[PDB]
Amino acid sequence: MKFNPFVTSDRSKNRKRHFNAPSHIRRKIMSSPLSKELRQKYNVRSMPIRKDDEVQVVRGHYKGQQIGKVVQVYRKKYVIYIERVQREKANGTTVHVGIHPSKVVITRLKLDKDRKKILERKAKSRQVGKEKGK
Amino acid sequence: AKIKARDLRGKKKEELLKQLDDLKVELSQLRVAKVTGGAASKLSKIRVVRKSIARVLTVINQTQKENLRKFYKGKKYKPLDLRPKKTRAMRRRLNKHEENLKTKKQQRKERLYPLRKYAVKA
Amino acid sequence: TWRRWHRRVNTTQKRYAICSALAASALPALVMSKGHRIEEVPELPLVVEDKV
Amino acid sequence: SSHKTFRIKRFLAKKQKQNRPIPQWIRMKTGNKIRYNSKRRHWRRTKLGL
Amino acid sequence: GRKRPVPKGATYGKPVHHGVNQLKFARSLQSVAEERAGRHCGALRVLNSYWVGEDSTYKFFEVILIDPFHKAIRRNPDTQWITKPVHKHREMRGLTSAGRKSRGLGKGHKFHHTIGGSRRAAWRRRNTLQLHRYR
Amino acid sequence: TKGTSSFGKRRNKTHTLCRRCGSKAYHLQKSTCGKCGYPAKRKRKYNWSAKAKRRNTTGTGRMRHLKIVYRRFRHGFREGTTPKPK
Amino acid sequence: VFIVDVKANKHQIKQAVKKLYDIDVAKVNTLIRPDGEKKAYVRLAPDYDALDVANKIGII
Amino acid sequence: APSRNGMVLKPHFHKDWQRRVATWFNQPARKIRRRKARQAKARRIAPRPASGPIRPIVRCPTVRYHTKVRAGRGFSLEELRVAGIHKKVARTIGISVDPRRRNKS
RNA sequence: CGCGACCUCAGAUCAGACGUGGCGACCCGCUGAAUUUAAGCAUAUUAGUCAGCGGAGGAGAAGAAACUAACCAGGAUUCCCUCAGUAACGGCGAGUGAACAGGGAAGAGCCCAGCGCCGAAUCCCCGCCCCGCGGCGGGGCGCGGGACAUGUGGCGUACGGAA
RNA sequence: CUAAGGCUAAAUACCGGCACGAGACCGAUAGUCAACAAGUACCGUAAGGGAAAGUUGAAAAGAACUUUGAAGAGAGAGUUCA
RNA sequence: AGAUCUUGGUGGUAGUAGCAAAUAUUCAAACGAGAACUUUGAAGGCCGAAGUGGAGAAGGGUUCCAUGUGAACAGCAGUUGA
RNA sequence: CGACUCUUAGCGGUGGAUCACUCGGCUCGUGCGUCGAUGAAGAACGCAGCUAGCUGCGAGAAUUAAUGUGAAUUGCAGGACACAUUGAUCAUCGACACUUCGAACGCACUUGCGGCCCCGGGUUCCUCCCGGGGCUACGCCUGUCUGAGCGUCGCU
Ligand SMILES: [Mg+2]
Ligand SMILES: [Mg+2]
Ligand SMILES: [Mg+2]
Ligand SMILES: [Mg+2]
Ligand SMILES: [Mg+2]
Ligand SMILES: [Mg+2]
Ligand SMILES: [Mg+2]
Ligand SMILES: [Mg+2]
Ligand SMILES: [Mg+2]
Ligand SMILES: [Mg+2]
Ligand SMILES: [Mg+2]
Ligand SMILES: [Mg+2]
Ligand SMILES: [Mg+2]
Ligand SMILES: [Mg+2]
Ligand SMILES: [Mg+2]
Ligand SMILES: [Mg+2]
Ligand SMILES: [Mg+2]
Ligand SMILES: [Mg+2]
Ligand SMILES: [Mg+2]
Ligand SMILES: [Mg+2]
Ligand SMILES: [Mg+2]
Ligand SMILES: [Mg+2]
Ligand SMILES: [Mg+2]
Ligand SMILES: [Mg+2]
Ligand SMILES: [Mg+2]
Ligand SMILES: [Mg+2]
Ligand SMILES: [Mg+2]
Ligand SMILES: [Mg+2]
Ligand SMILES: [Mg+2]
Ligand SMILES: [Mg+2]
Ligand SMILES: [Mg+2]
Ligand SMILES: [Mg+2]
Ligand SMILES: [Mg+2]
Ligand SMILES: [Mg+2]
Ligand SMILES: [Mg+2]
Ligand SMILES: [Zn+2]
C-alpha cells in the first residue's frame, strides 16, 4: 500500500484535489485507454483525451462498436462529446451527451509532434520499467 | 493578426512608441463603437487591443530598466529601485565579508590549536 | 486533550500475555474457534524452512 | 444633502453602482448556487452606513 | 519613589492596596535614564551608562550609545555583536547592566526566584502541570 | 419627552468615515477615530476583545505584499535572475 | 459630450480634445455624474462644426 | 466537607491551572527528533566518538553519595599538567577540561 | 583690533546611512486588580494572574561562579525525572511552597577595561587604476581629507600574564 | 568564590504565520460564529454585537406541442428507472 | 414530559378584535379582462397667505425624469405608485 | 335523513424531523519559521463584451513578460491558435509594473493651499498662463559647509 508520508489517503483531501484541479491536470485526469491495436503499436496503455481523436463507448447507454470523433473536451464538467452520442430534447434539437473519458477507448490518435513525443516518452518509461523488473 | 513580445524586443524606441500610439488610437475607436453599439467582433477586440498595449508597454519598460541596470553596473551608488529588494531585515544584516572576517587573536587561536581528526580505540 | 488516553501495563504481564497467545496458537481447537480455516494444514505449529 | 463632499459623493456613487440585480446569464453558469442579489438595498428600508 | 497614578489617591480595593505614597519603582533611575536615551535615539544601541552627578531632585547619568550601521562599528569583530537584530532596545528588554540588576538574576541560594532565565520563566515552570502520556 | 419626540431632533452626525481603517467612527469634534485612533501613530488594539482583533487582524484584507513575500520565501528571495531561456 | 477621467481638469480636457481630434474648442463645462464618472461638455469654436466632427468621430 | 475517616488533603488547584497544562503528545516525536540529531552528529564527526570527549573520574559530593563515583565535566588543569597535555590542545584532541575544578587529593 | 587655534553650541531640502508602523501563539522589561476561597471579613488567597504599556527573534531569555557544599567533595546556562506537596511561609487558619545532592537531553567556551610594551602600530571617508559585480569586496596609489595621545590597534584577562 | 564591564550554539517554548500528515472526534440545532457571495446580511452615534442559509437528476434529458384563462394557475402530451 | 428550559414549526382564540383624530363627495367618459380609489371633463366642498401654497438649511441618496410590468410591497383595491 | 363534534384508517396538504451523504470544522503531530520609508498590515476607489457579490487584479487593472505544459476557455457571443518562421489553456513565477489614503513624509483635511529645480506649449527667454517630470516630514549617526560665544587662549 501507500508508504510515502507526503501523499495523503484522506478521502476529503483527495476529493477536494480532484474537484478543484486546474485544467492542466484535469487533462491528465481525463485520460482514456487505448485500443488493443494501439496498445500493441505504441507500447503505451493510456493517453489523455484530445480534441480530434476517434473513440468508441464501452459503458452506459451508448455502448457499441461504432466509432465517433471527439468534438469537445469539457474539462469543467469532466466530460467529452462524441459525434453521434447525442439525444433529442423537447423542442426537437439535438444535444451532445457528455460521458466520462474513462468509459471510452481511443481507436485512432490525433497525431502531431507533441502527441508523438508523449507517446515515445511513455513507451520509453514502460520499457525501462520492464528491463528493471526482468 | 496579433503582436508578440519576441519580435517587439528587437525594435527600438521610435517604432515601439509609434505602435503603442496606433494601439491606443484603435482602442479609442473600439470604445466609441462599444458606446455606439457596434458589433460583437469589435467588442471582443477590446481585450485584444488592451493586452497588446500591455505587451508593448512592458517591453518598453523592461528594455529601459535593463539599460539602466547596465548603466549603473559598476557604480558605487545605485537607485533604490535598482538595488536588490530581498527583505528589510535581509538588507540590514551584515554582508559576507564583514560577516566572516575575524580578529587576529581569533585567527591565531585557529592557527595554533586547530581541531584534529581522531579516533578512539575501544 | 488531557484525558489520560494511554495506559501502562506491567512488563511481566505483557510477557505473560505473549506467552498465553503463543501457547493458544498451537491448539487446533482455539485456532479453529478463531475461524482460521485450518482443516488441511499439516501441523498446527506450522514451521517452514528459512528459504521463505 | 445638496451640499456634499467629494468623498461622500464617491461613496454614494459606488453604492448606487453595486445596488443592481444580477445578470440573467449568471444562473446558467456551471455550479452557480446563486438565485438573486442578496445584498440589494432600498433607500427607505435600510439606511447607509454614513 | 513612584507615586501611584490614581485620581485623588483612591485605589478602590482592599486596604492592602490602598498605598499611594512610599511606593517604589522596580527599576532603578539609571535604568530609566538608559530607557529614555534609547527611546529618543531609537536608531542607536544602548551599551551602558554611568553616574555623573545628582541633586536633591535630579540624577544625572551619561549613556553610551553605538551607531550599529557605522562602518567602524560594523567592520570590527568583538563589536559586531551589537549590530545583530536581537540586540536592539536592550535597555527596554532589561539587558544592559543597569536594567539587569532589577531582574534578580545571579547564581546561588539568594537568586532562586529566577532559575530558568527570569521570574516569569521560573513561575511558568513551577506552576505548569506536567501531564505525561502515562500517569 | 425622552423617547419618540426626542428622537426627532437627531440631525448632527457625531462620527464620520475615518481615512485610516475606513470605519464610521471618526469623532469629528474630538478629531479621533474611536476604532483605530487615527491621529495616533499606533493602531488602537485591546486584548479584552479578541473578536475585535480578529475582525481587523492581518489576513482579513488583501495582503498584497505578504502574499508575494510568502511565495518568494520558498525560493530564497532570489532576485536578478530569469528562468533559462528556450 | 465626453466621459473623461475624474482626475482630468478643464485645461487637460481641452488640450486632449484639441490634440486627438484636431479641433479648436471654445470652452469646457465639467460635472461629475451620480455614478462617479466625470462628464465634459466641450463647446467647439464657431468655425468647427460639432455635427461633422461627431461624424468623423463615429458617434452620429 | 470531611466525611468520616480520611486524609486531610491539600490540592494545589486554586490558581487557574488549566491555562498552564503541559501535555506530552509530542514525546515520541521528540524522541525521534533527538535520535535523528544524534545520528546526524555522529555522521558529522565521522571517526570521532559519538558521545563526545572523555570525562574525568569524579566522586559525588555529599555524604549520601560519596561512595559512588561518576563522570565529571572535564579534566582539571593540574591533571593535564602532570599528564603532560596542553590545556589548549586537550580540547582539540577530544579531552574535556575544567579550569575551575581543583584536586584536593 | 583684527586675524588664528581649540572648546561648547547652532543651521542646512548639505553627502551617505539608520529608526518609526504591523503581527504578537511562544519570549523579555514593567505595571497590575477584583470576582473567588477563607462557609462572615480586614492579613492571607485569587496572583505577580486578568486587563494596561513597552521591546525582540526564529526562537527568546539565561549562561561560563563574588556558585553548591561541608563531602574521600562537586563545577557555566537551559530542559526532563526525582528531591517534594518536602525544608519553610501562613488570622501557623484557609492555604502556599522552593533549593542542593542524584539520574539523564545537550554540552563550548571566551573577550575587554585596567597594569604594561610597541616611533598611532589603529580606524572612517573621498578621488584614480585593475580584478570582480550580483548582497558590493579584493589589491595598489594620493606632500588626498577626517577621527584619534581627553587613547585607536597588536600582545594580554585571574585557568595567571609579560620580558 | 573574586561583584559593581561584554559576548556565546545545542538541548527548551510556540492556541499567530507558510506547507503538510493523521485521528476509537463532530456530522448541518452537531463541528469554528462561519461546510453556502460569513465576520457577510443586519443592529448601534460609537466602542461593539452578529445570524439564518447544504442535497433535482447518471445525464437538463429543466416538460416541445395542443387547450381554458388577462395572468397566476390547470388539463392533456412529453423526458426519465423515477 | 417537565427546567417561566434552547431552537424550529403548528393550533384554539378567530374569519374574531379591528381597518372610527383632522366636514365630502357625486355624475359622465376614456384606457383596460377587470374601476368606489387611475386619467380627463362637469359639479359640490376643504386648506384660506402664521396654507394642505411656492422655495431652502440639516438629514436622506437616486427617492428626480420617461417608458414598461402587474409576481411580491403600497394592512381594501388599483389600469396607480416614493 | 343532514350539520357539527370525537375516534380510527386511506389519500392529499402544512412542516422539515429522521436516515444516508460531506470540497467543512475540531484535535494531535511534523517541517519551516519570512513584514515595513526600496513604503507594510489595514482601508478606499476603480478594472471584464455582456459582471451585482465572492474571488483576482491596479490605469499594462478577472492581468503583461518569462519558464514549464501542450489544445482549449465555456453561461452566451466573438475572435484567435499552420501547436515549426513557435502555442489555446493552465501551472509556476525569478523580469516588468503596481491608483488614493494609511508609520504616511511639502502644509492640511467632513475642505483645500504652497515653495524650489528642470522640460514642453501659449509666450517668442522674461518671466506671466497651462501641462509634464523631480524634490520639499520628524528624529538620529558619521562626515561636509556656513556660522555664534564679555568660553579658554595665541599673535598683533
Ligand atoms: Mg585584543
Ligand atoms: Mg426613515
Ligand atoms: Mg487581601
Ligand atoms: Mg434618558
Ligand atoms: Mg458634539
Ligand atoms: Mg462645477
Ligand atoms: Mg541630504
Ligand atoms: Mg468569603
Ligand atoms: Mg460562602
Ligand atoms: Mg461577602
Ligand atoms: Mg496581559
Ligand atoms: Mg515596534
Ligand atoms: Mg541571546
Ligand atoms: Mg546574556
Ligand atoms: Mg571568570
Ligand atoms: Mg514522598
Ligand atoms: Mg504565591
Ligand atoms: Mg549526555
Ligand atoms: Mg591599549
Ligand atoms: Mg452550525
Ligand atoms: Mg438534518
Ligand atoms: Mg397572482
Ligand atoms: Mg421513487
Ligand atoms: Mg420534548
Ligand atoms: Mg422528569
Ligand atoms: Mg369585525
Ligand atoms: Mg372600525
Ligand atoms: Mg374655507
Ligand atoms: Mg411650505
Ligand atoms: Mg416619480
Ligand atoms: Mg393591499
Ligand atoms: Mg402527508
Ligand atoms: Mg504570460
Ligand atoms: Mg475649512
Ligand atoms: Mg575667546
Ligand atoms: Zn479609524
Residues in chain G: 60
Cell numbers describing residue H77: 588543569
Rounded, the Å distance between the CA of E66 and C1' of L115 is 37
E55 touches strand I (CB under 7 A): no
User: Are C2 and H25 in contact (CB < 8 Å)?
Assistant: no
Distance (Å, rounded) from C-alpha A69 to C-alpha A54?
4
D2-8: Cβ within 8 A, 24+ apart: D6/G32, D7/F17, D8/D50
If you measure CA to CA, which chain F residue comes closest to D11?
F17
Partners of residue B86 in chain F, C-beta under 8 Å: 77, 79
Chain L footprint bases within 7 A of protein beta carbons: 22-24, 27-31, 34-46, 48-53, 56-81, 83-84, 86-87, 89-91, 93-98, 101-104, 109-112, 130-132, 139-142
Distance (Å, rounded) from C-alpha D39 to C-alpha D19?
8
Distance (Å, rounded) from C-alpha B79 to C-alpha B64?
14
Query: G52: helix, coil or strand?
Result: helix
Q: Does H44 touch chain B (CB under 8 A)?
A: no
Chain I footprint bases within 7 A of protein beta carbons: 16-24, 27-35, 42-82, 85, 94-112, 123-127, 132-138, 153-156, 159-160
Backbone angles phi and psi of A69, in degrees to 5: -75, 135
Closest among D46, D37, D45 to D17, alpha carbons compared: D37
Distance (Å, rounded) from C-alpha E96 to C-alpha E37?
13
| Strand (E) or helix (H) holding A32 | strand A31-33
User: Are B119 and H48 in contact (CB < 8 Å)?
Assistant: yes
Resolution in units of Å: 2.7
Chains that touch D (3 or more CB pairs under 8 A): F, G
Cβ proximity of A49 and A115 under 8 Å: no
Q: C17-32 in b/e burial notation, b at 16+ Cβ within 10 A?
A: eeeeeeeeeeeeeebe
Q: According to the annotation, is F33 in a ligand binding site?
A: yes
Partners of residue H23 in chain C, C-beta under 8 Å: 1-2
Distance (Å, rounded) from C-alpha G17 to C-alpha F82?
43
Partners of residue E129 in chain H, C-beta under 8 Å: 17, 20-22
Nucleotide nearest to E84 (CA to C1'): I57
Tell me how far the alpha carbon of residue B10 lies from the centroid of ligand 24, in angstroms: 82
Query: How far away is chain E from the Cα of C44, in angstroms, using its nearest Cα?
Result: 38
Query: How far away is chain G from the Cα of B28, in angstroms, using its nearest Cα?
Result: 10
Cβ proximity of H24 and E133 under 8 Å: yes
Rounded, the Å distance between the CA of D40 and C1' of J41 is 10
Partners of residue E130 in chain H, C-beta under 8 Å: 22, 24
H30 touches strand J (CB under 7 A): yes
What's the CA angle centered on E20, arms E17 and E25, to 5 degrees? 95
Q: Does H29 touch chain E (CB under 8 A)?
A: no
G43 DSSP β-pair partners? G27
Partners of residue B106 in chain E, C-beta under 8 Å: 77
User: Are B103 and E77 in contact (CB < 8 Å)?
Assistant: yes
What's the CA angle centered on A71, arms A68 and A75, to 5 degrees? 120
Q: Give chain D's largest Cα–Cα span.
A: 47
Indicate which technique resolved this structure: cryo-EM
Cβ proximity of G13 and G40 under 8 Å: yes
User: Are B86 and F80 in contact (CB < 8 Å)?
Assistant: no
Write the DSSP assignment of chain E as a string of letters. ------GGG---S-GGG---SS---SS-HHHHHHHHHHHHTTTSEEEEEEEEEE-SS-EEEEEEEE-TTSHHHHT-TTTGGGGSGGGSSHHHHT-SHHHHGGGT--SSTT-GGGTTSSHHHHHHHHH-EEE-S--
Q: According to the annotation, is F18 in a ligand binding site?
A: yes
Cell numbers describing residue A113: 509532434
Phi-psi region of A44 (alpha: psi -120 to 50; beta: other; left: phi over 0): beta
Rounded, the Å distance between the CA of E12 and C1' of I42 is 14
Cell numbers describing residue E70: 557605522
Closest among A44, A49, A35, A25 to A123, alpha carbons compared: A44
Q: According to the annotation, is F35 in a ligand binding site?
A: no
A1 touches strand J (CB under 7 A): no
Query: F74: helix, coil or strand?
Result: coil
Distance (Å, rounded) from C-alpha A74 to C-alpha A101?
10
CB-defined contacts E:H, below 8 A: 22
| Strand (E) or helix (H) holding G30 | strand G25-32
Distance (Å, rounded) from C-alpha B85 to C-alpha F79?
8
The sign one gets for the Cα dihedral F65, F67, F68, F72 is: positive
Q: Does H43 touch chain E (CB under 8 A)?
A: no
* Contact yes or no, E with H (3+ CB pairs under 8 Å): yes
User: Cell 485645461 appears where?
Assistant: G11
Q: According to the annotation, is F56 in a ligand binding site?
A: no
- Pseudo-torsion of CA A38, A44, A49, A52, nearest 10°? -40
Alpha carbon C8 to chain centroid, angstroms: 20
Q: Give chain G's largest Cα–Cα span.
A: 34
What's the CA angle centered on B83, arms B78 and B86, to 5 degrees? 165
User: Are E129 and H22 in contact (CB < 8 Å)?
Assistant: yes
User: Are B98 and E85 in contact (CB < 8 Å)?
Assistant: no
Tell me how far the alpha carbon of residue E71 lies from the centroid of ligand 19, in angstroms: 21
Radius of gyration of chain C (CA): 17
Rounded, the Å distance between the CA of D24 and C1' of L77 is 15
Nucleotide nearest to F13 (CA to C1'): J45
Partners of residue E132 in chain H, C-beta under 8 Å: 24, 27
If you measure CA to CA, which chain C residue comes closest to H18?
C2
Partners of residue D50 in chain F, C-beta under 8 Å: 16-17, 24
* Contact yes or no, G with C (3+ CB pairs under 8 Å): no
Residues near E55 by beta carbon (within 8 Å), at least 6 away in sequence: none
β-strand A94-96 against A86-88: which pairing, if any? antiparallel
B65 touches strand I (CB under 7 A): no
Closest among A27, A34, A26 to A123, alpha carbons compared: A34
Q: Does C50 touch chain E (CB under 8 A)?
A: no
If you measure CA to CA, which chain H residue comes closest to B114?
H92
Distance (Å, rounded) from C-alpha H20 to C-alpha C2?
12
User: Cell 517452514 appears where?
Assistant: C48
Rounded, the Å distance between the CA of E41 and C1' of I10 is 20
Q: Which of residues 26-55 of F touch strand J (CB under 7 A)?
A: 34-35, 46, 49, 51-52, 54-55
Chains that touch C (3 or more CB pairs under 8 A): E, H
Cell numbers describing residue E89: 532596545
Q: Select from G1, G5, G57 the residue whose CB has the most chain B CBs within 10 Å, as the one to mutate to test that interface.
A: G57
Q: Does E131 touch chain C (CB under 8 A)?
A: yes
Partners of residue G57 in chain B, C-beta under 8 Å: 32
